[PDB]
């Protein structure tokens, strides 16, 4: 069952071809991926220890929970309080990692601590099920996530309107991957090759990433997450660099369609609108976020409450270098807090809290 994609022989071969190609390479080639799941593949399998000194793999901002603005997390919290006072208790669902994400004003966990009803769920369906089991209350799901996660949200919003659920709301903090890559391009982040996130591609297909190679000539390679997927993509990128080629190779063709997945596309489009959005520790990226259209404003928990989120909320604790880690400009180990005051159990920054955070992945796997 796809064993080849995990095959040691297949890997030892790819590693050799890669090595061969780099021996005759000048300078240094830097490949960047933008999906924590890929960073997990790379780090979990020790792929970096198999690469030639002149070939580097850097992790971009491929972690939706990490980049969620603290202003939005605080807002959601200010609304929980704003309801407890209006006598309207709310049931808040969030992902396990997001649940513990820090902000200068506390996490959703510190909230639970204050007696609020915050619940960890694994998907939007869980939230849906909670909205039907608790009719006497309003259930809201702080919804972050890239396209791959936006779709299941849009899909659930279709099954919510038909049923006419009224206690099914969500705080949208969805983000788009492609725009983030283009902002990183215009800002100097160095890399001659891209490893596009397989599953985000499954949704927007190969077509969604083309607009980048055409406008910047950067070779891209949609890849899966098995170890040989990443090794194949590295080889395929090294060669397009050496040959001067600048196109997109769909190495994850077994799961990705050129057009992608139309159902989800429209499903998302029917409910979400692209807008300018802030990325925690990164800045405000143009047309990089998704918010509910005026027609479905009834599903946005912010359409039922107006809170004043204090200004100048710092994005990170002093000493945290998660912003640079997210840009592929810094390694977790470059950080002084890494593995000291900052660990998965007692995290200082968001990169260590998230399951797809680069810092957590490095810590969890003992990078060498």
């Amino acid at each position: 069952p796809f064993e080849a994609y995990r095959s040691r022989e297949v890997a030892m071969k790819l590693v050799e071809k890669i090595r061969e190609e780099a021996k005759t390479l000048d300078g240094e080639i830097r490949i960047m991926h933008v999906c924590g799941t890929h960073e997990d593949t790379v780090t979990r399998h020790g792929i970096r220890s198999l690469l030639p000194e002149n070939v580097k793999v850097v992790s971009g901002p491929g972690c939706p929970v990490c980049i969620t603005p603290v202003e939005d997390i605080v807002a959601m919290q200010l609304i929980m309080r704003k309801a407890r006072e209006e006598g309207e208790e709310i049931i808040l669902t969030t992902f396990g990692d997001m649940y513990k994400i820090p902000t200068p004003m506390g996490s959703f966990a510190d909230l639970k601590s204050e007696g609020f009803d915050v619940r960890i769920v694994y998907g939007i369906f869980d939230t849906y099920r909670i909205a039907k089991e608790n009719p006497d209350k309003t259930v809201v799901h702080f919804s972050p996530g890239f396209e791959t996660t936006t779709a299941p949200a849009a899909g659930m919003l279709n099954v919510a309107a038909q049923e006419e659920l009224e206690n099914f709301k969500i705080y949208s903090v969805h983000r788009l991957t492609p725009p983030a890559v283009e902002v990183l391009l215009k800002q100097g982040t160095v890399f001659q090759g891209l490893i596009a996130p397989g599953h985000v591609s499954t949704i927007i297909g190969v077509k969604g990433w083309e607009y980048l190679t055409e406008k910047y000539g950067i070779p891209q390679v949609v890849a899966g997450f098995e170890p040989n997927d990443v090794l194949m993509a590295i080889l395929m990128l090294i060669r397009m660099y050496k040959e001067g080629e600048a196109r997109i190779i769909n190495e994850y063709e077994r799961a990705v369609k050129y057009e992608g997945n139309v159902v989800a596309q429209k499903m998302i489009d029917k409910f979400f609108e692209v807008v300018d959005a802030k990325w925690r520790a990164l800045g405000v990226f143009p047309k990089s976020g998704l918010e509910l259209r005026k027609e479905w404003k009834d599903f946005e928990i912010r359409s039922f409450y107006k809170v004043e989120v204090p200004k100048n909320l710092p994005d990170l604790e002093k000493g945290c270098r998660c912003g640079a880690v997210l840009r592929g400009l810094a390694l977790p180990t470059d950080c002084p807090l890494f593995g000291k005051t900052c660990t998965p159990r007692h995290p200082v920054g968001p990169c260590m809290v998230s399951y797809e955070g680069t810092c957590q992945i490095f810590y969890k796997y003992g990078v060498l």
Binding site: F2, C35, T148, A151, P152, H199, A264
Partner: protein, 53 residues
Amino acid sequence: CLAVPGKVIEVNGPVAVVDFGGVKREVRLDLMPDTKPGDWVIVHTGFAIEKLD
């Protein structure tokens, strides 16, 4: 985005029973209507997002 693949063993409307190597879980097929038993899908947060070819 754990994205683990499974073999669909039962389809019942927008719900399916996926088998992840001796471990079954129910999955929404909203984004993969064409899904049918015997198929292999990628599951993200309880939803099927694509079929493996």
